[PDB]
Amino acid sequence: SREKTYVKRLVKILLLGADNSGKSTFLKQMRIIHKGIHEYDFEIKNVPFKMVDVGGRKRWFECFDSVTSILFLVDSSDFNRLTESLNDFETIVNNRVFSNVSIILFLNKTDLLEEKVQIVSIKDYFLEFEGDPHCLRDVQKFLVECFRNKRRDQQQKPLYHHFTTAINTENARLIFRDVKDTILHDNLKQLMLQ
Amino acid sequence: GPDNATLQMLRNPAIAVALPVVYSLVAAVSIPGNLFSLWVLCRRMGPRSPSVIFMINLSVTDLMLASVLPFQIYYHCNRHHWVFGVLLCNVVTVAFYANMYSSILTMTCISVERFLGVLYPLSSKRWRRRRYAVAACAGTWLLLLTALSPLARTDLTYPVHALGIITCFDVLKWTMLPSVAMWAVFLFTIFILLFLIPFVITVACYTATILKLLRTEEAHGREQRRRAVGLAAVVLLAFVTCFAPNNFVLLAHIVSRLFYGKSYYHVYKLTLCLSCLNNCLDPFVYYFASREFQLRL
Amino acid sequence: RIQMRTRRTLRGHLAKIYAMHWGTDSRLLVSASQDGKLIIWDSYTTNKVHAIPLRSSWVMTCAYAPSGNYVACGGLDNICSIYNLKTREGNVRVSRELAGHTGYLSCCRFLDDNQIVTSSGDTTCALWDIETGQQTTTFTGHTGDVMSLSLAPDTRLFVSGACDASAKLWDVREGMCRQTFTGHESDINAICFFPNGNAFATGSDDATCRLFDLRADQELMTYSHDNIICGITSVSFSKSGRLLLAGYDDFNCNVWDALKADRAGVLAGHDNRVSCLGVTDDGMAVATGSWDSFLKIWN
Ligand SMILES: CC(C)=CCC/C(C)=C/CC/C(C)=C/CC/C(C)=C\CSC[C@H](NC(=O)CC[C@H](N)C(=O)O)C(=O)NCC(=O)O
Say if residues C272 and C251 touch (Cβ distance below 8 Å).
Answer: yes
Q: Report how far residue A18's alpha carbon sits from residue A92's, in angstroms, rounded to the nearest whole number.
A: 12
Find the angle CA(A57)-CA(C162)-CA(C211) to the nearest 5 degrees.
145
Whole-number Å distance between alpha carbons of B283 and C108: 54
CA distance C250 to C253: 9
C-alpha of B18 from chain center: 19
Residue A109 annotated as binding site? yes
- Which of A37, A49, A52, A59 is best to mutate for the C interface (most C CBs within 10 A)? A37
Nearest by Cα to C30 from C59, C67, C58, C72: C72
By Cβ distance, the residue of C14, C58, C121 closest to A4 is C14
Task: Among B7, B12, B171, B172, say which to mutate for ligand 1: greatest number of ligand atoms within 8 Å of CB.
Answer: B172
- The separation between CA B117 and the C-alpha centre of its own chain, rounded to angstroms, equals 24
Reported residue count of chain A is 194
Burial of A148 (0-12, 13-18, 19+ CB in 10 A): middle
User: CB-CB: which of B121, B126, B293 is closest to A192?
Assistant: B293
| Residues in chain A preceding a C-to-N separation beyond 2.5 angstroms (breaks) | 34, 56
Query: At B53, which CATH number?
Result: 1.20.1070.10
Q: For residues C134 and C100, what is the distance between their CA atoms, to the nearest angstrom?
A: 8
**How many CB contacts within 8 angstroms connect chain A with chain B?**
67
Query: How far apart are alpha carbons C127 and C153 in whole angstroms?
Result: 17
Q: Is C166 helix (H, G, I), strand (E, B) or coil?
A: coil
- Residue in chain C closest to A64 (alpha carbons) equals C58
Beta pairing, strands C294-298 & C6-11? antiparallel
Residues A179, A160 contacting (CB under 8 angstroms): no
Q: Which of A14, A68, A69, A73 is nearest to A39 (CA)?
A: A14
Query: What spatial distance separates the first Cα and last Cα of chain A, rounded to whole Å?
Result: 34
Query: A58 and C76: CB-CB below 8 Å?
Result: no
**Bridge partners of C11?**
C294
CA distances from A35 to C78, C100, C265 (A): 9, 11, 46
Cβ atoms of B85 and B92 closer than 8 Å: no
Q: Measuring CA to CA, how many Å separate A49 from each of A70, A103, C13, C55? A: 13, 16, 20, 18
- Asked if C56 contacts A37 with a C-beta cutoff of 8 angstroms, the reply is yes
- Name every residue in A having a CB less than 8 A away from some CB of B: 5, 8-9, 11, 45-47, 158-159, 176, 179-181, 183-194
Per the annotation, does A12 bind a ligand?
no
Interface test with A, best of C38, C57, C79, C148 (most A CBs within 10 A): C57
Q: How far is CA C270 from CA B188, C259, C273, C290, in A?
A: 51, 28, 7, 7
Distance of CA A26 to the CA centre of its chain: 12
Terminus-to-terminus CA distance in chain B, angstroms? 56
Question: Strand, coil or helix: what is C248?
Answer: strand
Q: Is B122 near chain A, with CB under 8 Å? A: yes
Separation between Cα atoms, residue A85 and residue A108, nearest integer Å: 12
**Measured between alpha carbons, how far is residue C150 from residues A68, A175, C192, C202, C237 in Å?**
36, 44, 6, 10, 12
8 Å CB contact between C135 and C144:
no
Q: How far apart are CA A149 and CA A130, in angstroms?
A: 14
Q: Are C263 and C225 in contact (CB under 8 A)?
A: yes
Q: How do the domains of chain A map onto residue ranges?
A: 4-183
Task: Tell me whether residue C50 is exposed, middle or buried, using C-beta atoms within 10 angstroms of its C-beta: 0 to 12, 13 to 18, 19 or more.
Answer: middle
CA angle (B284 as vertex; B280, B285 as ends), nearest 5:
105
CA of B178 from ligand 1 middle (Å) equals 14
Touching partners of A (3+ C-beta pairs < 8 Å): B, C
Closest CA to B275 of B108, B62, B92, B41: B62
Ligand 1 centroid, distance to B58 Cα (angstroms): 29
| Buried residues in C172-207 as b, exposed as e (16+ CB within 10 A) | beeeeeeeebebbeebbbbbbbbeeeebbbbbbbbb
Angstrom distance (rounded) from CA C238 to CA C229: 25
Q: Cα–chain-centroid distance for residue A42?
A: 18
Closest to A164 (Cα-Cα) out of A176, A175, A149: A175
Cβ neighbours, 10 Å, residue C3: 8
H-assigned helices in chain A: 4-7, 23-33, 82-93, 110-116, 136-148, 171-190
Q: Give the position, in ligand 1's atom list, of the atom nearest the Cα of B191.
A: 3
A55 contact residues in C (CB cutoff 8 A)? 76
Query: Is the CB of residue B113 less than 8 Å away from at least one CB of chain A?
Result: yes
**Domain span including residue B125:** 4-294
Ligand 1 centroid distance, CA of B171 (Å): 6
Residues of A in contact with C34 (CB under 8 A): 63, 66
Please say whether the beta carbons of C22 and C29 come within 8 A: yes
Calculated CA dihedral for residues A84, A85, A87, A89, nearest 10 degrees? 170
Are A174 and A182 spatial neighbours (Cβ–Cβ below 8 Å)? no
**C209: phi then psi, degrees, rounded to nearest 5:** -90, 140
C-alpha A122/C-alpha A130 separation (Å) is: 7
Q: Which residues, 6 or more positions from A34, have their beta carbon under 8 angstroms from its beta carbon?
A: A42, A43, A44, A172
Residue C255 CB partners (closer than 8 Å, separation 6+)? C2, C4, C243, C244, C245, C263, C264, C265, C266, C267
Those residues with Cβ within 8 angstroms of residue B149's Cβ, 6 or more apart along the chain or in another chain: none
Measured CA to CA, the distance from residue C29 to residue C20 in angstroms comes to 7
C243 burial type by CB count under 10 A (0-12 exposed, 13-18 middle, 19+ buried): buried
Closest C-alpha to C107, from C276, C282, C224: C276
| CA dist., res. C24 & res. C280, Å (int) | 8
Please give the DSSP secondary-structure letter assigned to residue A124: G
Q: Kindly report the length of chain C.
A: 299
- Smallest Cβ distance to A37: which of C35, C58, C144? C58
User: Which chain B residues contact residue A187 at CB under 8 A?
Assistant: 117-118, 121
- How were these coordinates obtained? cryo-EM
**Cβ-Cβ contacts under 8 Å, A159 against chain B:** 220
d(CA B129, CA B48): 10
* Rounded distance between C-alpha atoms, residue A124 and residue A116, angstroms: 13
Q: Where is chain C discontinuous (C–N over 2.5 Å), named by the preceding residue?
A: none
Q: Are C171 and C152 in contact (CB under 8 A)?
A: no
A181 contacts B218? CB cut-off 8 A: yes
Contacts 24+ apart (CB under 8 A), B119-124: B119/B208, B119/B209, B119/B212, B121/A180, B121/A181, B121/A183, B121/A184, B121/A186, B121/A187, B122/A11, B122/A45, B122/A47, B122/A176, B122/A179, B122/A180, B122/A183, B123/A45, B123/A46, B123/A47
Q: Do C60 and A60 touch (CB under 8 A)?
A: yes
Other C-beta atoms closer than 10 Å to the C-beta of B46 total 12
Q: Which helix (H) or strand (E) holds C95?
A: strand C93-99
Min CA distance, A20 vs chain B (Å)? 30
Distances B91 to A98, B64, B114, C63, C257 between C-alpha atoms, Å = 56, 12, 34, 62, 60
Best CA proximity match to C92, nearest among C126, C68, C75, C120: C68
Which of helix, strand or coil describes residue B5?
A: helix
The radius of gyration of chain A from alpha carbons, rounded to an integer in Å, stands at 18
Determine contact, residues B160/B1, Cβ cutoff 8 Å: yes
The alpha-carbon radius of gyration of chain B (Å, integer) is 21
Asked if A127 and A149 count as a contact pair (C-beta separation under 8 A), the reply is no
User: Which residues of A are less than 8 Å from C18 in CB distance?
Assistant: 63
Cα four-point dihedral sign C205, C211, C214, C219: negative
Q: Which residue intervals of chain B are DSSP H helices?
A: 4-9, 15-38, 50-66, 69-77, 86-119, 130-147, 150-153, 180-191, 197-215, 222-260, 265-276, 278-282, 291-294
Parallel, antiparallel, or unpaired: how do β-strands A102-108 and A69-75 relate?
A: parallel
Provide, as residue numbers in chain A, all residues whose Cβ is less than 8 Å from the Cβ of B232: 193
CB neighbours (10 Å) of residue B35?
Answer: 14
Contact A158, B220 (CB under 8 A): yes
- What is the arrangement of strands in the sheet containing C243-248, beginning at the earlier edge strand? C232-237, C243-248, C253-257, C265-267
User: Residues near ligand 1 with C-beta < 6 Å?
Assistant: B 1-2, 6, 97, 171-174, 183, 187, 190-191, 194-195, 254, 257-258, 263, 265
* A28 labelled binding-site residue: no
CA atoms within 13 A on the CB side of A171: 27
Is the Cβ–Cβ distance between C70 and C95 less than 8 Å?
Answer: yes
Kindly report the backbone phi and psi dihedral angles of residue B242, in degrees, each rounded to the nearest multiple of 5, phi listed first.
-80, -50
Separation of B71 CA from ligand 1 center, angstroms? 20
Buried-exposed string C208-224: b where 16+ CB fall within 10 A, e elsewhere:
bbbbbbbeeeebebebe
* Sequence letter at residue C64: Y
Residues in chain B: 297
Measured between alpha carbons, how far is B2 from B263 in angstroms, rounded to an integer?
A: 13
Task: Please name the amino acid found at residue A11.
Answer: V
Q: Which of A7, A37, A57 sits opposite C14 (nearest CB)?
A: A7
Query: Do C294 and C3 meet the contact criterion of CB atoms below 8 Å apart?
Result: no
User: Is B70's Cβ below 8 Å from some Cβ in A?
Assistant: no
- DSSP one-letter code for C249: S
3-class state of residue B220 by DSSP = coil
Cα C252 to Cα C274: distance, rounded to the nearest angstrom: 6
The response to whether A75 counts as a known ligand-binding position is no
Interchain CB distance below 8 Å, A46 and B123: yes
Going along chain C from its start, the domains and CATH numbers come out as 1-298 (2.130.10.10)
Residue owning the nearest CA to atom 39 of ligand 1: B173
Resolution of the structure in the document, Å: 2.9
DSSP, residue by residue, B85-145: -HHHHHHHHHHHHHHHHHHHHHHHHHHHHHHHHHH-TTGGGTT--HHHHHHHHHHHHHHHH
* Domain count of the fold of chain B: 1
DSSP secondary-structure letter at C197?
S
From the CA of B172, give the closest atom in ligand 1: 27
Contact predicate A139/A133, CB 8 Å: yes
CA distance B294 to B287: 8
Q: Sign of dihedral through CA atoms B296, C3, C7, C9?
A: negative
> How wide is the angle at C-alpha A28 spanned by C-alphas A22 and A31, nearest 5°?
135
User: CA Rg, chain C, in Å?
Assistant: 18
**Is A30 within 8 Å of A172 (Cβ atoms)?**
yes
Q: Does A111 carry a binding-site annotation?
A: yes
**Helical residues (DSSP H) of B39-85, grouped into ranges:** 50-66, 69-77
Rounded to whole angstroms, the Cα distance separating B208 from B224 reads 18
**Nearest Cα to B110, choosing from B198, B32, B30, B224?**
B198
Any A CB within 8 A of B46 CB: no
Instruction: Calculate the CA C119 to chain-centre distance.
Output: 12
For C129, residues 6+ apart whose C-beta sits below 8 A from its C-beta are: C114, C115, C136
- List Cα–Cα distances, B57 to B44, B78, B248, in angstroms: 15, 33, 25
Q: How far apart are CA B146 and CA B152, in angstroms?
A: 10
User: Is A58's Cβ below 8 Å from some Cβ in C?
Assistant: yes
Question: B128 and B116 in contact (C-beta within 8 Å)?
Answer: yes
Class of domain A4-183: alpha beta
Closest CA to C279 of C261, C259, C249, C253: C253
